[PDB]
C-alpha cells in the first residue's frame, strides 16, 4: 500500500497539491524516492517544479536536503537548474550544500550558469558557490555561462566576495593583487599611460570631470608612463590648468621627476606657459631642482618665464 501512496505523495509534491501532500506525508515516506525515472524524492520534485509552499512544508517535517536522485542531484540542483530563486534560498537557509556535486561533478552553480539563471547565480555566489570548481570534463561554471555578460557577472561577484574575505583576514598581498587587476589602473602596454594621463591630456571640455571621477575611483595620481611622466607633467606641458588643479587637490607630488630629472615646472617653463608656471609655484613646485642634464626650470625658459620664477 505504501507504494501506491508513495506515487501519490510524489505526485502531490510535483503538482503543488498541499492538501493531498499533508494527508499523505508521514515520517516513513518524507524521504521516499520514486521507483523509476530520476528516482526523485518529494523535495527534489517540489524544488524542480517550483512548489515553494510544499518545499517549506517538506523541510518543516523532516525532508532531507542532502538526498540524492539517480544522477547524484540534490534538490538544490533541481531548483537552480530551473531558476526557482525562492526555492533555492529556502533550501540554502536549511543547510543545503552550495557546492554539492552529482555523479558528473556538476554543482548547483554549473546548473544555474549553464541555463543562464543570473539571479540564482548571484544568490549561489553569496552563499559561497565557487565558480572555478570543475566538473568531470574540466569545465567550471564560468565556462558553461552561455553569454559573456553572465561570464563577466560571475567573475565580478566572485572577485567581490573574495576581496571581502581577504579584507576580513587582513591578507594584504591578496587584497593588493585583486586591486592591481582593476581596470582603473590599466596601463597602455607600450606607452604605460593610464586613463588619468589620457584624461588630463584631453582636448575635450569635460576633461576636468573625467579626471576628478577617475581619481575618486582610485586612479593613482602619481602614476608614471614610459618616460616616467606623471599626469601633472602631461597637463603642465600642455597648459591644461583645470586638471592640474584637480591633480593638486588629490595630492599630486608637485616635484615628481621624469626620466630626464625634470619636474612638471621644467616642462611648463620649457613650453613658455606663464600662467601654468605661476600655478605650479603656487602649489609648491620647487624651482631650484636641477634636471639630469644640469638645468633649472629658469635656465630652460624665456625671459617672461624667468621673471615669473623670481616673483
Amino acid at each position: 500500500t505504501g507504494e501506491y501512496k508513495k506515487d501519490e505523495l510524489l505526485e502531490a509534491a510535483r503538482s503543488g497539491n498541499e492538501e493531498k501532500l499533508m494527508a499523505l506525508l508521514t515520517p516513513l515516506n518524507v524521504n521516499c524516492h520514486a521507483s523509476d525515472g530520476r528516482k526523485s524524492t518529494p523535495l527534489h520534485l517540489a524544488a524542480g517544479y517550483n512548489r515553494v509552499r510544499i518545499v517549506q512544508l517538506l523541510l518543516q517535517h523532516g525532508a532531507d536536503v542532502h538526498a540524492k536522485d539517480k544522477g547524484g542531484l540534490v534538490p538544490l540542483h533541481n531548483a537552480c537548474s530551473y531558476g526557482h530563486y525562492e526555492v533555492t534560498e529556502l533550501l540554502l537557509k536549511h543547510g543545503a550544500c552550495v557546492n554539492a556535486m552529482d555523479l558528473w561533478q556538476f554543482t548547483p552553480l554549473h546548473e544555474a550558469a549553464s541555463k543562464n539563471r543570473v539571479e540564482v547565480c548571484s544568490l549561489l555566489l553569496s552563499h559561497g558557490a565557487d565558480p572555478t570548481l570543475v566538473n568531470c570534463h574540466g569545465k567550471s561554471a564560468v565556462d558553461m555561462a552561455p553569454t559573456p555578460e553572465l561570464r563577466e557577472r560571475l567573475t565580478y561577484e566572485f572577485k567581490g566576495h573574495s576581496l571581502l574575505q581577504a579584507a576580513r583576514e587582513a591578507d594584504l598581498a591578496k587584497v593588493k593583487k585583486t586591486l592591481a587587476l582593476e581596470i582603473i589602473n590599466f596601463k597602455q602596454p607600450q606607452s604605460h599611460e593610464t586613463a588619468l594621463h589620457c584624461a588630463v591630456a584631453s582636448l575635450h571640455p569635460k576633461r576636468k570631470q573625467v579626471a576628478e571621477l577617475l581619481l575618486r575611483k582610485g586612479a593613482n595620481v602619481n602614476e608614471k608612463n614610459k618616460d616616467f611622466m606623471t599626469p601633472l607633467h602631461v597637463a603642465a606641458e600642455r597648459a591644461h590648468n583645470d586638471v592640474m588643479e584637480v591633480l593638486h587637490k588629490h595630492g599630486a607630488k608637485m616635484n615628481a621627476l621624469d626620466s630626464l630629472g625634470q619636474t612638471a615646472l621644467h616642462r611648463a617653463a620649457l613650453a613658455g606657459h606663464l600662467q601654468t608656471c605661476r600655478l605650479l609655484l603656487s602649489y609648491g613646485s620647487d624651482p631650484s631642482i636641477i634636471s639630469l642634464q644640469g638645468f633649472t626650470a629658469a635656465q630652460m625658459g624665456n625671459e617672461a618665464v624667468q621673471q615669473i620664477l623670481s616673483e
Binding site: 510535483r14 525515472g37 530520476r38 526523485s40 527534489h44 520534485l45 524544488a47 524542480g48 517544479y49 517550483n50 536522485d69 539517480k70 544522477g71 542531484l73 540542483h77 533541481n78 531548483a79 537548474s81 530551473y82 531558476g83 526557482h84 558528473w104 556538476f106 546548473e111
Partner: peptide, 11 residues
Amino acid sequence: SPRGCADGRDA
C-alpha cells in the same frame, strides 16, 4: 551513459 535532466520545469 550520458547525463540526464533534473526533474522540474521552467518558471
